[PDB]
């Protein structure tokens, strides 16, 4: 079985870099805090004790009100008068980090008017193993050097407007069968413990990690760590990945929370680099707590360092002082567990004063136009034979399919967007958001036609095959709408557990688009899904003229598209992962059956880097659309390749601080006068019997064989070859190559191009090319630009598993450019650097 | 048994009123016609041979092109690129003279540039008998006054737009049930005879007959008779309403055609006042006719004579003359059966030259626009505890309900609108167009919403009453639709036969209201349908804060009622019909079983005039809202009641025009390839007997001929006859009464002022409606209503007489808002 190694001790936080005044700040703030209060930061109350999906008590003496962590990544879950933004693929496809960062703003800006303290996302954890995965939509792209731009830029935007963002899941969560006890036991299935990511060392470095580098480089606070294991070490308490990856190598300096239900164990997941217990019972609403009133007492009883502690503080409070949340505090405004205006304070046993829950506050701005406008330059032109855009003087426009309508039970009618009924706006599970409103293609395209005086109708049951064939034969234009949900793993969908079960449309897709190209010349079809479906049925099909695939666009997906089909927008995006000819294609298989008996689910990555495009090219697949692929209306033209070559830290960490002092148990005993909430977690001990107050049946158990070599270890540690700066030692960041190349509008219409940078690393086991830069430029009709890029120690670089280090290895490398991974005119060798 | 007495000869035009330059023409024209041209005119050529729904074979040696007749009373059916109007009953809703004829003149244009030459509508028949009748939508109002003026004012529209209209169906086809042997029989009934409606002669005169009145005298071209019996004899060979009522009392000058099934024989139909035969054949492709080859051997052979059948061709052009339609005319440039662009030529047996049958020409010009507004103005705001209008400012709006929502089959997506799934804006069977969109009232609303940037939902599945309270609960308005359709009877749906089963609000729609309204004191319920519903569930719950009746709008929908929720358009529709407690408050009730063996059901309209407001009034019920109501953004004062007292008996012999020759002149022509199934005028051979194939031919001739049916002399002038829509002497104005109408609220509106007469007699309701009109008034401004009333208006009919006669029981005039709330009121002054 799959091993992970311990490393200890758990690296504390030290000013590096742009954290140094926050650092500074943090430190002289839990100096002055008692161990309990040090406690509360460290754990939330329990499951629906509060406002937000988490949260923690805060410290009230010292005027830190509890923290608030709310979802998700493309908008505020479970509020009200928020909007809903396309989902992080849509990020993806628009190649542009200006898009990403203005998009992440818009959130921060939302969450920061709610009360909301620590957004829960953005994603790149799942990266995208495998095409059916539930979840790789609310992240970017199977890409790592895109994902981690993009993800970078979004927490950027997220942070800028005075919010934690919390770059999720740390690490390896690629699929959601078998992510979780309980919820497989619902599904039938009996295990033990949750599948675990059986990953070598060059793989993680070099594709499941680098965004995370990006991630912790570009300044983020907060990582949530994954459900499933590593190497069979559950995601939230393995010190590989918390302690030597994320905090020894990377050099993170904020706090790490658990996924919910995703903490499972005080001391080993303290020792093992976790910050933050959520929502903090043991099971919801347990009225346990792996830390709390534990914590308190593993502190006490000498079983965890005072150290490792006041480094949870300093790691929290340095991330709300990072992103001045302390100079937007307010509390939460709204209620994530009803929509009354009044309530009683504390949900789930319904105690507490009985008081203002929900105040309604608007918090949406105008932010309609950044997501009407990131829907449209999300729409990826698949094909087009002349097809688009339309000029409005079609004289009958059928609209057909389910896809293009309502949803029958109102946009937000299915709990958690659990469903695929209607236009496919918004994925499900957690990752969600309520719609303020929801403009259908339906609607949008209805409007338009209707604005020129032609005549439409929308046919959205997708067996009434016979109205569709009729109607279809009488259109200048049939626009067919088809669609593929996923989603989290607790929610099932047609017995789709999370995971897609397979890559065809549903709702009787590819018939519905038969039946209207058998009898319209002119069948244009538009894809809403989570992640590439398979098009083989019908793309080649004569009469299918034009085909685009948009994603999960928010709220305004039926504008972004009207956008896109009269013109209003030339569509640039970019497809962010392959379309192959069949599901054996893209390999990487979901581990979907028990293989180790009534054990936890052995997920091995025998692939290693070789996922979405990097393996259709090591098989020498043809993709149908490859990874990087979108038409314009426009055409563009690469050349006059250029190459340059630029002219282009401590050993030891200082000793484990402690901040504060810790007194006698009876200090930290239930204080009087205080009324104990049913459920709510607390950090105090009912008395100074310490085994007692912890009610744990493994006190004091062979305690010292739990604790691990080096676990305690306060002393000064060495520097990690690869480490020592934000996101990597920071000669990685070296810009060793400038690379630049003209490009050229050479048609009729104003566009953007979206210029594609790939290297091969050469050797015998490495992907022929894998993306390195990129960027969106706008061009007028025979317009000319001069795109300059760098490329980094880092960009050129292999992880060696001997040196534990990025090495430039002495295989000579290329670099190419041009419009797609498979269309690539321009290639130049590099010298050596 | 019920029984139709014989009356003969069927009177022949002469050229009365406004029809003396038509009727010349006619003549003109008619007298240069061979026997089996005349007979070309008067019979369609076959169910499905041609182009339109009904066509004939015109007379190409004259340059008269075959006449193409098409549905439907709200627009083209069968074609594309057209428009689809607001059905009659919005028309009715709306009280205004000028929108119904707007309403003509926009869909006679639509037909023209079809090369449509005869509209087949408007309707008023049905009236209107019982609350559940499927077709009554397409028609009016129950009330006679009310139907029979919007009815003469859509003729008019349509005939000064240069389309022929026809008013239909002549006469008494108040419910669907039992209307058609074939129908029946499909429905598990087994009738040898339609389904008899029996009226005494006082009720047909007051009540059914007087929009047909009313249509004859503003110049209708053509009248459809009906598939039912009157009196135990068929509508479309009624001797009694078609040559006594129709022709000899109302003057009618134009032309009769039977309804498509309705034609029952060759002889008894010609010699009772048919003038056109529709399809043409016996049943739909039968490859018989009872006139084609049949009529040319009635004349022929001396048993009709040629004086009636020269009536009917002068009948038929003269009407085509009276509209212009010779300086408009083209052939159909589309095909009721295939949208196809190529086709043969004749569709039923697919032969004929292989060549275009559809030209896609698209007549719609800007007719949205009266759409849109006919939409608005015939929203009738039942109930408003001052929750409208909506300002924009709302911020979280719920829509609920189906019939918010889009049909997902597409707008069209139910042959002949036979089904009732999403928004219900037209109800079903012939009187049906296709849509060329629908703006579904999700769609206007969210779309208004968004422009104010606030929050909106739609939910469209009635049974989904989890999410609607969920969403109820947090909304601050929400706005429920609600639906009950009907049909023409050969279509079901949900088992209801055209006929509705109940008066209850289909899919769930009780429920529905009831799951909200426990939910937002702001519950606003918005009603789509063919007539009145039962409302007394939820009319009056606490958090139903507002209740509308739209219709049936046609295209615009939801455009239309935006319109009036947000304060653009300020509501002035009045009730055409009566908004009861029960279904049992109507009276009324459908024939539903066969109560004469395996004979013709017999349907006694033994309740006499009491028909809607007439019999509630009578049994002192207390409708939920009265016929004449609805509510207006502001507020209208009534006063001053003013009263003032005001200042040929033979016809001509029966003409022939032009010349009958030997048989042999009538045979088929020797070039001519026969279509098969066509209809023609032409004989086999000079064997008449064997030419017509009638197994009854020559047997007992004279016995089946009713005396005086071949009678050609000079006819007395019947005393209640004479002018265009009967004597003229009834149209003396004999009183001229006057008000003062003052906006007294803050909204710039119209008013629906409306005038009762209490004719007095122990028989008579207790009020009935004679004048209206719909005024505009801004905030605070006053206008003088001046109105007159027409000896006609202060007669009832008396048998005895065979006349309208003013009775000695002293007479009261009404005025007010509605039928129920009239302040002013005073004795009239006898007048004679
Ligand atoms: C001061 O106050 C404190 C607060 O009150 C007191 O804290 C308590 O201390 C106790 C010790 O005194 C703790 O109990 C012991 O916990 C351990 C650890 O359990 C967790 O981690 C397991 C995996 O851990 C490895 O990795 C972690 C880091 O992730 C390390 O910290 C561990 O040291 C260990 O490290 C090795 O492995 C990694 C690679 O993975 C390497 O990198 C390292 O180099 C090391 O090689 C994990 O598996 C546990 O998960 C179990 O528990 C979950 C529920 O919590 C459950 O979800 C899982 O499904 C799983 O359940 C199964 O096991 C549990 C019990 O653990 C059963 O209840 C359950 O029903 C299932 O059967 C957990 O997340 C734990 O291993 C210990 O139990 C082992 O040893 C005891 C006997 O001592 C046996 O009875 C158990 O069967 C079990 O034995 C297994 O392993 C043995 C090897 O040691 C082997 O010999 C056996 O064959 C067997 O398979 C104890 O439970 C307690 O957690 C803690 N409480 C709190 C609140 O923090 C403190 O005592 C006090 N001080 C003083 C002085 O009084
Ligand atoms: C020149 O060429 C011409 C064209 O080719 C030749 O034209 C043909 O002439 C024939 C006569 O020679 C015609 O055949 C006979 O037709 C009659 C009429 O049938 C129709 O009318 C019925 C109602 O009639 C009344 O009303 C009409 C006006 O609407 C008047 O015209 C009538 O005079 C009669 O008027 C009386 O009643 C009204 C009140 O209602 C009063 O106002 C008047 O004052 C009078 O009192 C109608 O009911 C018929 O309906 C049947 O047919 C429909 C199918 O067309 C069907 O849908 C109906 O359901 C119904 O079906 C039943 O009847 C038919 C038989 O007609 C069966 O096939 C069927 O199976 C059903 O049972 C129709 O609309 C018709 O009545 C005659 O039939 C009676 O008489 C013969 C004996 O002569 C019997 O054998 C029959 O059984 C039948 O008997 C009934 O009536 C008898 C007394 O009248 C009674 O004694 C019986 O007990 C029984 O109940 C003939 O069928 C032929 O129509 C016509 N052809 C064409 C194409 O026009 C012409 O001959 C030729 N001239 C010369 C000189 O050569
Ligand atoms: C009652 O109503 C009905 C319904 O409207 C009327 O029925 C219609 O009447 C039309 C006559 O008015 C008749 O029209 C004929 O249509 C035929 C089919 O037309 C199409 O195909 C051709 C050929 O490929 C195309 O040219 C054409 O554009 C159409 O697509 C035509 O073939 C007929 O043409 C003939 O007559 C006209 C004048 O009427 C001539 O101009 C034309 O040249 C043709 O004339 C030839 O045939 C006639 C006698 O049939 C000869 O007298 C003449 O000399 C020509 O003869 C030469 O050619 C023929 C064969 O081509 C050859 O055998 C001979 O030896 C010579 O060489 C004409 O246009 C409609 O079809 C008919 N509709 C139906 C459904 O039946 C009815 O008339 C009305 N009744 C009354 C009393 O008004
Ligand atoms: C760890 O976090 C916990 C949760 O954030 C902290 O617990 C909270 O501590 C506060 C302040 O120390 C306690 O507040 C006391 O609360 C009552 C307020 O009750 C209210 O009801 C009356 C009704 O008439 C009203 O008058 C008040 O305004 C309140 O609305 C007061 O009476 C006291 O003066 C005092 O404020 C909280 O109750 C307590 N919360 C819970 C859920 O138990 C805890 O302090 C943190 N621990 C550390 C070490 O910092
Ligand atoms: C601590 O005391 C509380 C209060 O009586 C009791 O309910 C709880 O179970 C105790 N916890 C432990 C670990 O004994």
Known sequence: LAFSPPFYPSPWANGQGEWAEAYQRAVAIVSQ?????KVNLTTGTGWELEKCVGQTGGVPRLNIGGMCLQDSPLGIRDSDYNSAFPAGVNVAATWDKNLAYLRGQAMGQEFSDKGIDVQLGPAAGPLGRS????????????????????????????????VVATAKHYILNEQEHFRQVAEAAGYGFNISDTISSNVDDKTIH???????????????????????????????????????LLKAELGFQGFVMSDWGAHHSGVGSALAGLDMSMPGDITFDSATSFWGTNLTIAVLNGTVPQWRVDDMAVRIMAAYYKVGRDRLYQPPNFSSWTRDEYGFKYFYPQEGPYEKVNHFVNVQRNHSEVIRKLGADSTVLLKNNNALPLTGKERKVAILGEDAGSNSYGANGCSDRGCDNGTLAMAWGSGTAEFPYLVTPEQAIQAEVLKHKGSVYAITDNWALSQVETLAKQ??????????????????????????????LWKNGDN???AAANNCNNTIVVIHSVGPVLVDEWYDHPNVTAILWAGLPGQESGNSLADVLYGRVNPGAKSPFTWGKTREAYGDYLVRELNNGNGAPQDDFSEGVFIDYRGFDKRNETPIYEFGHGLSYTTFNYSGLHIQVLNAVATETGAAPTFGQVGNASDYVYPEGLTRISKFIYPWLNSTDLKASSGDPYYGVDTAEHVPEGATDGSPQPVLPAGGGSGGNPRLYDELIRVSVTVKNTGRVAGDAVPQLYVSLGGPNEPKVVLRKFDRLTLKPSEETVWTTTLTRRDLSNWDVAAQDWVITSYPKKVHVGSSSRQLPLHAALPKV
């Open 33 to 37: 805090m008692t161990l309990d209060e």
């Open 131 to 162: 095409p059916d995965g539930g979840r790789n939509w609310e992240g970017f792209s199977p890409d790592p050097a895109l994902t981690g731009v993009l993800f970078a830029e979004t927490i950027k935007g997220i942070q800028d407007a005075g």
């Open 206 to 244: 070099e594709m499941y990690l680098w965004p995370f580098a990006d991630a912790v480089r570009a300044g983020v606070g907060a990582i949530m760590c994954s459900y499933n294991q590593i190497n069979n070490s559950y995601g939230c308490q393995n010190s590989y990945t918390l302690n030597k």
């Open 475 to 504: 259109a200048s234009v049939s626009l067919v709408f088809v669609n593929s949900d996923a989603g989290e793993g607790y929610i099932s969908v047609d017995g789709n557990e999370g995971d897609r079960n397979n890559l065809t």
């Open 512 to 514: 519905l688009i038969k």
